[PDB]
Symmetry: D2
Subunit: 316 residues, 4 copies
Amino acid sequence: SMLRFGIISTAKIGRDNVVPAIQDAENCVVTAIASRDLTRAREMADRFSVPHAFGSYEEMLASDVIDAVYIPLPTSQHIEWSIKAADAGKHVVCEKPLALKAGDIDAVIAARDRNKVVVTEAYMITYSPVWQKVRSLIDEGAIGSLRHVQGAFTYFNRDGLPDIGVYPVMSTRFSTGKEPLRIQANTERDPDFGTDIYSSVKADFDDFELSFYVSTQMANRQIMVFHGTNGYIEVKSPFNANRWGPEEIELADRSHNESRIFRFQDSRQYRREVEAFARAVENGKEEVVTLENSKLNQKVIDAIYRASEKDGWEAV
Amino acid sequence: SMLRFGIISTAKIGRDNVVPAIQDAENCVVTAIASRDLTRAREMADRFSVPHAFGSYEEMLASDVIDAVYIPLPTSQHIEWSIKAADAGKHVVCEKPLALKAGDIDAVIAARDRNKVVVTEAYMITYSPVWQKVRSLIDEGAIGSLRHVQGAFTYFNRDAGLPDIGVYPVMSTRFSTGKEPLRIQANTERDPDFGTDIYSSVKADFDDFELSFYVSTQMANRQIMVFHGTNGYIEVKSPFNANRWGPEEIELADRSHNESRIFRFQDSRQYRREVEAFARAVENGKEEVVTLENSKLNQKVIDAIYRASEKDGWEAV
Amino acid sequence: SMLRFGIISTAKIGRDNVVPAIQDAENCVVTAIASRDLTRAREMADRFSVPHAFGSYEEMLASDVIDAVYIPLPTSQHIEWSIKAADAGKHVVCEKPLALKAGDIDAVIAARDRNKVVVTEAYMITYSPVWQKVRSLIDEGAIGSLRHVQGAFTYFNRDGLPDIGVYPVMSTRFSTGKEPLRIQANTERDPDFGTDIYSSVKADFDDFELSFYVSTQMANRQIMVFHGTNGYIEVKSPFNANRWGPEEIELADRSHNESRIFRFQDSRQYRREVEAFARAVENGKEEVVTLENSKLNQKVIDAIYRASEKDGWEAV
Amino acid sequence: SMLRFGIISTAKIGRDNVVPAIQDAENCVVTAIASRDLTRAREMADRFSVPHAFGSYEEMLASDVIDAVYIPLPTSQHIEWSIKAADAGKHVVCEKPLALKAGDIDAVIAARDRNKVVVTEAYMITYSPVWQKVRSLIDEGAIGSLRHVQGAFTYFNRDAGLPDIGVYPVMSTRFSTGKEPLRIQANTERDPDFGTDIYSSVKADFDDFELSFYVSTQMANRQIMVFHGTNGYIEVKSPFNANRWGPEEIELADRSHNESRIFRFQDSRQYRREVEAFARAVENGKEEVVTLENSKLNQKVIDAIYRASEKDGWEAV
Ligand code: NA
Ligand code: NA
Ligand code: NA
Ligand code: NA
């Protein structure tokens, strides 16, 4: 029996990645799409073999044709609709970042617990074999003691920064199981419309440091390197996976005279995400990203904002 | 309006690649799956959001809930079902290789023309931006004069065909160059136990250049194609299985090798492009789709490779 | 006519890289090696086809069989012997880092000018086609406006940190023609012997930031990436060149859908260094790293030490 | 005590690679250079810190200032000067290819044995850690059973040979496997104007596996060798010119391709390793250096490639 998904809006992330992945997925299916525009919803539904189209989110939430919703709305709309979906008895996969600040996630936790539904922030990377292999290799001692994590995530768009800043943070927290204690950061804003377009960050995790930069006005780039006393792990396509490059990691030894390449081509990380979610709904034991965790992640982002207003370290 | 696909059988190639690509595709959709085992069909249909499941191929063909069929059956069954589908008024995407012998394709051509439906062999690579770029770069003079094409396609399987991979170095070379080979030298080896072909090394003379490659069903997985000319070479990284093998990119190296250009086409979704091209062809009659005439020319090369494998020298195509 | 080199000591950097490069070089040759241990000098001389061996540095400096010296002594001995060589009328190639403090370089400048000899710090990378191509590409607008330079230089040795920290700094200054204004850094010391074994640095160059880390107790790694609005340049083997990997750079465009690879295999950067030095001796016009530039570089390193003792930014 | 080398001629291969490598080498040194043009010899000698320059080969061979010679003359001059050097009591490193025909090597063998000097053809690659690792990995079972070796060696030069590059795919395969080919199919093309050989495509049957490759003096620069087995494959990134071409490394891919190992040997200095091995062989008589007997077996393959190029099918080696 398939977990039945409803899609809130015809947003591009849904159209290009998640909706086709749900149709591909073994244990779920999309039964409905909802948009303020019935015509748009119907058009997307027709394309992807979806039986139902609704002219409002509320009408889909009230329906019994879905068990769960996917929410690829802008961040400013995540809390409202995650809560309404849960209050309608639906399980929720909400796109990252879940919230604008950490405290906002308490109300989503309350909605999860009160309605006894699964609610999770959509960090597809944490279901990828690539990131599971980074985490296991570090845990097995393959790089010795981790001392530095270095990375970057940039792209170019001139018509938000949190939407990419979260990734170096979540991937490091996931791979290590640790939380940073303090942050130094420097953020630059667009001269005209005043939004944040660049940030350089150093996070002290005590035993190691994470350093990275993000930008919405630089040439496309993404990389993460986990560097220890006995080796390093280079993640080639850390965030957008197959949409960026090969789904692989390199493990280099201490001298660099030998490396191992581990390949995970055609991993379909969005499909893995929704399959893990469906298992979690069915059995309650599957590792899915917890809201508690989502909150810890957002605490780091909030500390990065605070650090950007000061000259030195800011406690997380 | 979506072109409506029916799937003949629950074969793995359909389940793993083509069916999800049709659902992802902008101008088509899967409305039915058919299998001798109805339970199997229904299970697949449920998974992929497909409204209809049929307990026989004949029943799906007779239905008006599909406009077209996809046929991922074994080669020995391609001709029979391609023809029956066309005679039922359905357009046909048939998996490669279309036939066992070039001559067998004449009856499929007759079915296409008699029923006025689109019938095509499913060479997904020809709809990939990667292979379109190889073809345009060669045509623009980026490697000077083409002199040699070198490649390989191997995997390991001992659960107990070679044509299913041998066709790819041949089709990709023909597609990229627009030429046909005149003659072939080849050497083929068989499995000691079950007697089937498990290895072939081939050289094909295209007059102005040669193609050399080997294929095997009992070697470590590898795939590569290199188009090498007087002024550069093009290395195709992931020529056949694309994203399932590696990066969807090519390298153009200059004459000296002191400079290369890398062209990337990540997440091209070549199976989706294939069915989208097919749907356009059904709707307008002008879209480049692999013609049966071209399929026949391709099979003529494979047939010549069989003949060459029984001789010590060159065999004319 | 060949510029005749004398080698001060049988140090490993000389034996493994510079001495053979001088013999290979078109416009110079090694005529003498000097060591406190004459036997060692004679053994090295015999190996490399060098006619003279001396039992003291002073004796070689007094001789007319050399026109120039190469000095691969430890940093603490650079000033003394650079000055004595110049006062003996010899031109000087001194290994990096030239000095422990920027102010120490004034006496070397005085020796250069007083004796009218060429004196230069041995930044072999600045004579490499790789780094000349980075510089020209950035100057031509190939990456648009430079916004961030990210890199690393680490190796493992437990039997020092300035010897690698200078490289991210010099290569950035060389490639951009700019100086940093301020520095944030964090440095860690060996629990036992108290020396610096790790440093993470961010340098504000106003229009862009440089971030890097260095360590003498981590797996071998080296990389530099110059990242702008319209592309990025990745330098594959920035510092040790052929001893690390391919001598090449990748120029990626804004979208990453196309890159150019520029290759400079078998560049022999140490040979190119001494050839440039010999041309400078002969004509006075060749670009050679100036002591004034060496001093500017050391000012950055000094600022990194100072920054490591504070919470926030330190002015250079 | 350093083995003292004399260089016969100021040829470019010596100037660019071997002479500086001898000066770098731990157990030898260049003491003399000889050329018909004394001024040229003296200029080179001055550059490389070489104490003696001679105005004829004969005068250097008669001198006691050298123990050994390096001979980077054109192939047509190798036999003459290898023999004269040995007859003058000097050990010989002669550039590849040693001879034009296999039979020509018998007189060099006679000179080696008669004078009790070390004489070897300069296959620097066989002293490289890269090729030693290929050989050991194959021997250890890392790729299972070897089934196909595929490669290429091309460059572009149009002003007034193919053997100078054809020998490399052959020697590297023979070295890595320890086997000899039994028969050859080949096709060779000649320059329309000057009539020399500018392109060959070759397949060599080693019984258990085949070697396929092409070489050309009129194509974009390329070099690669892949040793492909049941269990894996080994890709040699910079097989022949090593650091001059690219990274000195190999990739060992497993059966599925889901894991590879990269072995790196940066700054191997293969020419220095060659002369160091040669000096050890002169001093102790036990060091592996390429034997003239092995050189002859190699040339037998090349001679069979010429013969195969004149016929339609297989030619026995
Ligand atoms: Na599904
Ligand atoms: Na579709
Ligand atoms: Na020299
Ligand atoms: Na030497």
